[PDB]
Amino acid sequence: MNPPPPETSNPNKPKRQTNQLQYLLRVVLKTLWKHQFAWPFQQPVDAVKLNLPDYYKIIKTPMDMGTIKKRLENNYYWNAQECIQDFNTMFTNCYIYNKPGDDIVLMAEALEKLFLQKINELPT
Ligand SMILES: NC(=O)c1ccc(N2CCOC2=O)cc1
């Protein structure tokens, strides 16, 4: 069974737009999105559809790139680090719920490497 997906707007949270956040959407997210291994991470895990009744019993801070994309589009974040933290939560969740060597873990490992490569240098 599925919890509500993470919020993508919050009126009492202040918004901001920065060059770095713009780059995270235009370049980082949009590029990762097209990778052959991106598909498992483009939406919240649907435990009912995927028959993973223990997923949310294990993962308490769910995150996915669809959520991140909507957050960036809504200027939800204060700064780039806040957004980078969501990517890191998404990768870490995958390593937590699964096991080394699993196909989905190999996917996350590859994406994480590409992600780090892209955020190594951000605009000023
Ligand atoms: N986020 C995860 O740990 C996760 C997500 C999806 C899967 N499934 C079910 C469909 O194929 C998969 O790899 C398995 C694990």
Contact between 37 and 91 (Cβ < 8 Å): no
As given in the structure block, the two tokens for residue 28 are 């980082």
Q: Is the CB of 106 within 6 Å of ligand 1?
A: no
Cα–Cα dist 32/39, whole Å: 10
Contact between 41 and 83 (Cβ < 8 Å): no
Contact between 90 and 66 (Cβ < 8 Å): no
Residue whose C-alpha is closest to residue 59's, from 81, 90, 13, 25: 90
Best probe residue, ligand 1, of 45, 99, 111 (max atoms within 8 Å of C-beta) = 45
Q: Is the CB of 5 within 6 Å of ligand 1?
A: no
Cα–Cα dist 59/96, whole Å: 8
Which residues lie below 8 Å from residue 1, measured CB to CB, with a gap of 6+? 47, 48, 53, 56
Atom of ligand 1 nearest to the CA of 51: 9
Specify the resolution in Å. Answer: 1.7
Q: For the packed helices 103-119 and 80-97, what is the interaxial angle rounded to 10 degrees?
A: 160
Give the method of determination. X-ray
Q: Is the CB of 122 within 6 Å of ligand 1?
A: no
- Positive or negative, the CA dihedral 39, 117, 56, 79 is negative
Contact between 55 and 47 (Cβ < 8 Å): yes
Strand locations in 22-99 (E): none
As given in the structure block, the two tokens for residue 87 are 């990517």
Cα–Cα dist 59/42, whole Å: 17
Q: What fold, for 18-122?
A: Histone Acetyltransferase; Chain A (1.20.920)
As given in the structure block, the two tokens for residue 44 are 């919240």
Residue whose C-alpha is closest to residue 2's, from 53, 66, 43: 53
